[PDB]
DNA sequence: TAGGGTTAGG
C-alpha cells in the first residue's frame, strides 16, 4: 500500500502517563492502527514524552489530522507528520512553520503556477515570487504561506513538486537568521 | 515533543 512513512504521524508533548495502550485506545478513532507506540528511555524504562502512531492508509492519518487539538490522557499533545530518520538531521526538520520555500522556478512562473500546484494541501495565505529587489530579476524562487502548518508539512515530507511544469525542491522555510545558524 | 538493538568485501 502506501509506505509507513507516510502513514505516521509523530505525537509529541504526551502525559507522562501515556502508554501503548492508552495512545491506541484514542487514535484508534480514526483508522486502523499498524503501529501505536511511546518512546521510553531504554534505561530507565520512563516515558520519553512523545511516541508514534502508524495508520493502516494515508487517508486515516489525514482525517486524524482534521481532528486537530487531540487530548489524550487528559493532555493536548502535538501530532505532526513523521519526518523520515534521514531527513530529521536536516536544520528546521521539526520547526512548526506555516510557510514554504520553492526552489528552481522558471522565469515565467505565476502565481496561477504556485496555487494549480499547493492548493490541494491546504488554504494559501500568501504567495511571493522573488525578485531581486533593485535589478528587478526574477531570482527562481518563491515562498507560499499556509493557514495550517499541517500543511507544510504534508507537502515537505514528499519528495517531487511540479510547478509550471517541472520539478521544483520544496522546504520550510527558514527566517535569514535560521539559514545563518544552519551554516 | 524526533524513533523501537534502524544506516557503508570483493
Not at 522573488?130 to 515530507?157: E, L, N, P, Q, Y
Request: charged share 30%; net charge neutral; hydrophobic share 30%.
Amino acid at each position: 500500500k502506501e509506505p509507513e512513512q507516510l502513514r505516521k504521524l509523530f505525537i509529541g508533548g504526551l502525559s507522562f502517563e501515556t502508554t501503548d495502550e492508552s495512545l491506541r485506545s484514542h487514535f484508534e478513532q480514526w483508522g486502523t492502527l499498524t503501529d501505536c507506540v511511546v518512546m521510553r528511555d531504554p534505561n530507565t524504562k520512563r516515558s520519553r514524552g512523545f511516541g508514534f502512531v502508524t495508520y493502516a492508509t494515508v487517508e486515516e492519518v489525514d482525517a486524524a489530522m482534521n481532528a486537530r487539538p487531540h487530548k489524550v490522557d487528559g493532555r493536548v499533545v502535538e501530532p505532526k507528520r513523521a519526518v523520515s530518520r534521514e531527513d530529521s538531521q536536516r536544520p528546521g526538520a521539526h520547526l512548526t512553520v506555516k510557510k514554504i520555500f520553492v526552489g528552481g522556478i522558471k522565469e515565467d512562473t505565476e502565481e496561477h503556477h504556485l496555487r494549480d500546484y499547493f492548493e490541494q494541501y491546504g488554504k494559501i495565505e500568501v504567495i511571493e515570487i522573488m525578485t531581486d529587489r533593485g535589478s528587478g530579476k526574477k531570482r527562481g524562487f518563491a515562498f507560499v504561506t499556509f493557514d495550517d502548518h499541517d500543511s507544510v508539512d504534508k507537502i515537505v515530507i514528499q519528495k517531487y513538486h511540479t510547478v509550471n511544469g517541472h520539478n521544483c525542491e520544496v522546504r520550510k522555510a527558514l527566517s535569514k537568521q535560521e539559514m545563518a545558524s544552519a551554516s
